[PDB]
Amino acid sequence: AYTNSFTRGVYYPDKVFRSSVLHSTQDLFLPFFSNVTWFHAIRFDNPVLPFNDGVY
């Protein structure tokens, strides 16, 4: 019930428009190649799990 999130969870941290720049921000992201909690959808009655710092 665990898998590898390749490059997922990257988003726009602000509503600023920027064009062709390499901007370095520091806030909450899902880390690269993290061990995200895979689930099966085909246990399945009541799958409650905690919310710590935001979930993907």
Binding site: Q26, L28, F29, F39, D53
Partner: protein, 31 residues
């Protein structure tokens, strides 16, 4: 999460991680 009573989905966790972005000429993130 609830579904509709009568699929390889994830759930991840967020952490204060530094990340370098790559905006394109359209203002979207390409890398």
């Amino acid at each position: 999460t609830l579904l509709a009573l009568h699929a390889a989905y994830y759930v991840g966790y967020l952490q204060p991680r530094t990340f370098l972005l790559k905006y394109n000429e359209n203002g979207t993130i390409t890398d």
